RNA sequence: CGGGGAAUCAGGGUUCGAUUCCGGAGAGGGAGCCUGAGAAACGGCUACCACAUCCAAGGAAGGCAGCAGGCGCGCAAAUUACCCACUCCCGACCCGGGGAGGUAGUGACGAAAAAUAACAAUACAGGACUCUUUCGAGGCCCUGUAAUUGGAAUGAGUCCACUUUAAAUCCUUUAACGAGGAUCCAUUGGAGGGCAAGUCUGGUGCCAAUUCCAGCUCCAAUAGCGUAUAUUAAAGUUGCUGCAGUUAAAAAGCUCGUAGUUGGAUCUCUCUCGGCCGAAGCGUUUACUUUGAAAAAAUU
C-alpha cells in the first residue's frame, strides 16, 4: 500500500483510418491556420469537442423537465459560455451540436496573443508564450494551449520582467552593448 | 510571490516544548546524536545475545 | 499428476545445474581464473589488486603478480591475474584461459582508445563471463556522483548494453564483488571446451 | 427455426455453448493442447541454440534458395528452423550460439513465399541483428 | 516480380487505373527484420 | 482465490481482474500442540517427510510466498540506500520502537504538459487592387521560397545563493556565463500492384528480360516509431438483438413415441372494541410494473 494516485487519462483518440486525404488535408489546414505542433493537438481538441457533443446528446435524450437535464445542461452551457465558445444568447443544448473545432482552437492563448496584436504571427505568438513573455492578469503563462476565458481576455499583458515590457534587456543586447 | 507557514510563540520555553525537534535544530536550539539506523539496529541485535550488565559492554 | 510431473522435471534440472555450478571453483575442480583488465589509463591497478586480496598465496613474475585466493568462508578458490591493454598476446592469452574477465573503468569516460582496441580484440576472440567495475566514483563530490553513474551508463550502453556497474572503493565492496563473481552464470566457449587446455 | 419462448434461456445458452465448441479459434484457445503443442509454449519469443544452417527452396513460379538456421529451443528442447533477413546477416550467426527467435509475423501462419518456415531471428549473442547489420554494435563470440 | 506483373495485368482487364510498368516493378526495397 | 473493478462500447455482448480496497487461504509438505481474550501462530514449540548448515564425530542449529540482495528459471521485472519528519500502530508511555510507511536511486510499463527556432530588409515567384482596350506602370499591398544579410529574444546546459527537506536531491525563484552550419545537426517505418507515397541511379549474375546489394526521391507519425504474441473491435464467421441448412458447410429413413418449450375465444372490501379514525380478516395465490427503505470507499 502506498499513498499515491493511479488515475489518469489519454486526452486524444487516434483516428480509426490512418490514411484518407480529406482528414489529412483538414488536419493540415488546422495546424497551419493555428500554428500547432502536431496532429496530436488537433486530435486533443477533437476529443474534447466529441466528449462535449456526446454529453449534450445524452442530455437531449432526456425529458424537458428532468432535474438532471436542467442542472447539468445549465452547467455545460455555462462552462461553454465561460470559455468564450458559445454566445450568452445561444444558451440552448441544441446549439452545442453546432460547434466546430475552430472555436476551441481560437480560444487558446496562442491565438489570443496573435489576435490581440502582441505577436506578428501565430508562430511568433507560440515562441513568445513559450519564452516567458506573456502573462494573464498577474501570472506568467508558459502554456500555448492555455484556454482563455472571457473575463481573462482583457488582461493579457506582457510580463513586467520581459525585455520588450518592463525593460531589462536580454542576453544578446547586453552582450552586444559591451563590445563597444 | 512565495507562500509559507508561520508560528509566533508566547515564550521561548513554549517554543522549546511544542515545536518539532527539527525546527528547533534549524535555529540551533537542538542537536541530535550522530548515529545511523544500521548501527543502532545491529547494536540492539547484539545486545540481545548477552544477559545482565554485559549488555552494556557492547561497542 | 501434473504437479508431480512438474516436480520431477524441476528436480532433474536443478540437480544438473547444481552439479555444473559445484564443479567450478570448488574442491573437485580447478581454481576460478579471473583476468583483470583496466580499460583506461587512469586506473591504479595495484590498489585494486590490494582490494581483491580468506588467504592469499602471492605468486609473482618479473613484472606481473598473479595470486591465488582461498576463501572457505564462501568456499571458493580464485586465481587472479592482471593484464594491461595493448599487450596483445598477454591479454589474448590470459583471456583465452580465463573464466571471468573483470573490466575496470574510470568514472569520467568509459574507456580510452587502447581500451576500445583491446575490447574489439576480446570481442573478436570470444568473451567469457565478464563483470564491469568502476573504480573512482567515490572520489568525486557527492552532488555529481549519481549523475556521473547515469552518464557512464551511456558510456557503457554502446558495447555492454544490459549490464550493471559495480563499485570498487573499500574492502566491503571488494567482498561484494567477490560474491558476485563466485555465484554467477558462466559463459561456456566451444573451442576451449572441446579441447583440453 | 429458433425457439423464442420466455422460458427458453437454458436451451438457448446450452445450444450456444456447443456451437461455440464448433469454431476452430474457440477450440484452439480453449482446448489447451495448442499451447501444449506450440514450440514457443504460448510465448512471443524464445531462445535457442543454433544446431546448424540449412537451406529451404522457395515457391515453384519464382525459384529462390533461402537460408535458415536450425535451432533447438532452451526451455522445452524442440527443434525449429528460423529465417534470416539476408545472406549477409547469416555471417553473424555460428553453430552453438544463443539466439532469440520470434514468429514470422501474421499471428502464427506460414510464409506466402518461403514454404514452411515459421520463425525469424531477432537477436544473436544477446545483441540484435538490426544493430549488427547497420554497424551500430558488434557482437561477442 | 512475375506475380505483380500478373496482378497489374489483372487490374488492367478490370479496367482501373494502373501505374506504368517499368524496371522497378517487382523489386525488394530493403531487408526486413 | 472471490468481489469491488479494467478494456472495447450504437444497442446487446466479448475479453480481462496474480496485483496496493474488502473477504479468504498459506508460510518447504503433512500433523500435534503450549501460552493467551484471541493462534491449530510458523521472524512460537514438537515430531515425521524432503532438502540443508557448523563439528574436535560426542553433538548443535534450520525455514525470504517481509525489505533489500543472490542463484535458478526463463521472452519477461529495480538499491544488500536514507528516516521515524508525514500517515498511523504498539508499549508501563506527551519522551521508546516500527524495511508498516515515508524519501531518494533504477525505471521510454503507462498517462499529462511541452523545445529543436522567430522577425526585418533585400532578391526572385505567385495573388489581389488603382490607372490603361491590352501590353504594361505600380517607393500599391498581400503571400511564399532563400548556397543573401541583420541584430533582437530565449531555453538545453555550466554554476553562487535562497527555497525544498528529518538531512538532502528534483521542481519553483534568482546572480554570472551560455546560439548561426543557432554542428546546441530527430528519429522510426513504409512506398516504383490496392488505402499516404517514384516514368530515378549505380554495381552484380541467367537466357532485352532478369538474383543479390548500395543509394537518391517521396510519404506518414513524431520524442517517439517498428516488431512478435495473445486478445478485443471491425464480424451479422456463434447471430438474444442478429446468420444460415434445393443447387455453395448443413433437414434426422419415416411416422405413433413421456419430460422441456409453446398453447384459441370469453367474466365492468369490511367486521369488532378504544379516540370521521386506529388495531383485526386481508381481498385466492403469484409473475409483471411503479414507489420507498436499506446497501463500503476508491473506480465510472
Curated annotation (Swiss-Prot), chain A:
SMART domains: Ribosomal_S4, S4. There is a cross-link at residues 92, 138 (Glycyl lysine isopeptide (Lys-Gly) (interchain with G-Cter in SUMO2)). The keyword Magnesium does not apply. The modification N6-acetyllysine is found at residues 65, 115, 154. The modification Phosphoserine is found at residues 152, 162. Pfam families: Ribosomal_S4, S4. Keywords: Acetylation, Cytoplasm, Isopeptide bond, Nucleus, Phosphoprotein, Ribonucleoprotein, Ribosomal protein, RNA-binding, rRNA-binding, Ubl conjugation. It is found in: Cytoplasm; Nucleus, Nucleolus. GO terms for cellular component: cytoplasm; cytosol; cytosolic ribosome; cytosolic small ribosomal subunit; extracellular exosome; focal adhesion; membrane; nucleolus. Component of the small ribosomal subunit. The ribosome is a large ribonucleoprotein complex responsible for the synthesis of proteins in the cell. Part of the small subunit (SSU) processome, first precursor of the small eukaryotic ribosomal subunit. During the assembly of the SSU processome in the nucleolus, many ribosome biogenesis factors, an RNA chaperone and ribosomal proteins associate with the nascent pre-rRNA and work in concert to generate RNA folding, modifications, rearrangements and cleavage as well as targeted degradation of pre-ribosomal RNA by the RNA exosome. This is Small ribosomal subunit protein uS4. It comes from Homo sapiens. The lineage of its organism: Eukaryota, Metazoa, Chordata, Craniata, Vertebrata.
Swiss-Prot record, chain B:
Mature tissues, such as adult brain, skeletal muscle, heart, and kidney, express low levels, whereas tissues and organs with significant populations of proliferating cells, such as fetal brain, placenta, bone marrow, and various glandular organs, contain significantly higher levels. Residues 34-52 have a biased composition (Basic residues). It is found in: Cytoplasm; Nucleus, Nucleolus. It comes from the Eukaryota. Residues 25-59 are annotated as: Disordered. It is linked to Diamond-Blackfan anemia 3: A form of Diamond-Blackfan anemia, a congenital non-regenerative hypoplastic anemia that usually presents early in infancy. Diamond-Blackfan anemia is characterized by a moderate to severe macrocytic anemia, erythroblastopenia, and an increased risk of developing leukemia. 30 to 40% of Diamond-Blackfan anemia patients present with short stature and congenital anomalies, the most frequent being craniofacial (Pierre-Robin syndrome and cleft palate), thumb and urogenital anomalies. Belongs to the eukaryotic ribosomal protein eS24 family. Component of the small ribosomal subunit. Part of the small subunit (SSU) processome, composed of more than 70 proteins and the RNA chaperone small nucleolar RNA (snoRNA) U3. This is Small ribosomal subunit protein eS24. It comes from Homo sapiens. The chain holds residues 68 to 126 of 133 of the full protein.
UniProtKB/Swiss-Prot annotation, chain C:
GO terms for cellular component: cytosol; nucleolus; nucleoplasm. GO terms for biological process: endonucleolytic cleavage of tricistronic rRNA transcript (SSU-rRNA, 5.8S rRNA, LSU-rRNA); maturation of SSU-rRNA from tricistronic rRNA transcript (SSU-rRNA, 5.8S rRNA, LSU-rRNA). The keyword Nucleus applies. Its main location: nucleus. It is found in: Nucleus, Nucleolus. Keywords: Nucleus, Ribosome biogenesis. GO terms for molecular function: GTP binding; GTPase activity; RNA binding; U3 snoRNA binding. The chain holds residues 52 to 252 of 804 of the full protein. Required during maturation of the 40S ribosomal subunit in the nucleolus. Residues 30-187 form the Bms1-type G domain. It comes from Homo sapiens (Human). Belongs to the TRAFAC class translation factor GTPase superfamily. Bms1-like GTPase family. TSR1 subfamily. This is Pre-rRNA-processing protein TSR1 homolog.
From Swiss-Prot, chain E:
May be ubiquitinated and targeted to degradation in response to pro-inflammatory cytokine signaling. It comes from the Eukaryota. Residues 7-33 are annotated as: Disordered. Induction: Up-regulated in CD8+ T lymphocytes by treatment with anti-CD3 and in B lymphocytes by treatment with CD40 ligand and anti-B cell receptor antibody. In macrophages, no induction following LPS treatment. Down-regulated by a combined treatment with TNF and IFNG (at protein level). It is linked to BUD23 is located in the Williams-Beuren syndrome (WBS) critical region. WBS results from a hemizygous deletion of several genes on chromosome 7q11.23, thought to arise as a consequence of unequal crossing over between highly homologous low-copy repeat sequences flanking the deleted region. Haploinsufficiency of BUD23 may be the cause of certain cardiovascular and musculo-skeletal abnormalities observed in the disease. Heterodimer with TRMT112; this heterodimerization is necessary for the metabolic stability and activity of the catalytic subunit BUD23. Interacts with GRIP1. Belongs to the class I-like SAM-binding methyltransferase superfamily. BUD23/WBSCR22 family. This is 18S rRNA (guanine-N(7))-methyltransferase. The chain holds residues 249 to 281 of 281 of the full protein.
